[PDB]
Amino acid sequence: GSLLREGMKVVIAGRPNAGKSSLLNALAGREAAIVTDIAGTTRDVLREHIHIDGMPLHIIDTAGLREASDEVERIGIERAWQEIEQADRVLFMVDGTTTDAVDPAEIWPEFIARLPAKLPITVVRNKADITGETLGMSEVNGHALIRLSARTGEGVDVLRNHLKQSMGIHRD
């Protein structure tokens, strides 16, 4: 390019099996939608591919932990030095108006951070019920609430446009 790059560390969560992978897929411009089994959460905790619209030849690694960052600076062929930022856009994924016990056991250890969350929105049947659990949304002041779905790309681009804007600074 012309001395003009950018990027950041993005994490994808929202309970195990609740439109996580299916989402990422739609994320990666790639078509061939491939999905595997956790087969054990990678140390680099980077199982959400490396989204990079800029250049093709670009390896990224999103840790978000001590041992993670350490493992990051090794898997991607790199000396065990220091050089890695923290998450920025921690978007959550919920399934309709479903409230599980694992729902909180994952979103709790997040509110207490220095970054936006951005919770999704539900649009399931029954009108007089959605709105109810649309504002409160458990708790916390979600950066922005945008509805979307897995199959149909209801609000994927909207979530994407709110990703490229986030990531900034950092030249490879």
Curated annotation (Swiss-Prot):
Effect seen on changing residue 44 to A: 9-fold decrease in GTPase activity and 13-fold increase of affinity
Amino-acid positions noted as binding GTP in the UniProt annotation, renumbered to this chain: 17-22, 36-42, 61-64, 126-129, 149-151
Effect of mutating residue 61 to A: Does not affect GTP binding, but impairs hydrolase activity. Completely impairs tRNA modifying function
Annotated binding of K(+), by residue: 17, 36, 38, 41
Effect seen on changing residue 66 to A: 6-fold decrease in GTPase activity and 1.9-fold increase of affinity
UniProt effect for mutating residue 46 to D: 1.5-fold decrease in affinity for GTP
UniProt: Mg(2+) binding residues: 21, 42
Domain TrmE-type G: 7-168
Protein's cellular compartments: Cytoplasm
Substitution effect: residue 41 to A: 4-fold decrease in GTPase activity and 1.5-fold increase of affinity
Highest taxon of source: Bacteria
Effect of residue 17 to K: 70-fold decrease in GTPase activity. 2-fold decrease of affinity for GTP
Effect of residue 73 to A: 1900-fold decrease in GTPase activity
Impact reported for residue 42 to A: 92-fold decrease in GTPase activity and 59-fold increase of affinity
Subunit structure: Homodimer. Heterotetramer of two MnmE and two MnmG subunits.
Record family assignment: Belongs to the TRAFAC class TrmE-Era-EngA-EngB-Septin-like GTPase superfamily. TrmE GTPase family.
Protein purpose: Exhibits a very high intrinsic GTPase hydrolysis rate. Involved in the addition of a carboxymethylaminomethyl (cmnm) group at the wobble position (U34) of certain tRNAs, forming tRNA-cmnm(5)s(2)U34.
Protein name: tRNA modification GTPase MnmE
Organism: Escherichia coli (strain K12)
Gene behind this protein: mnmE
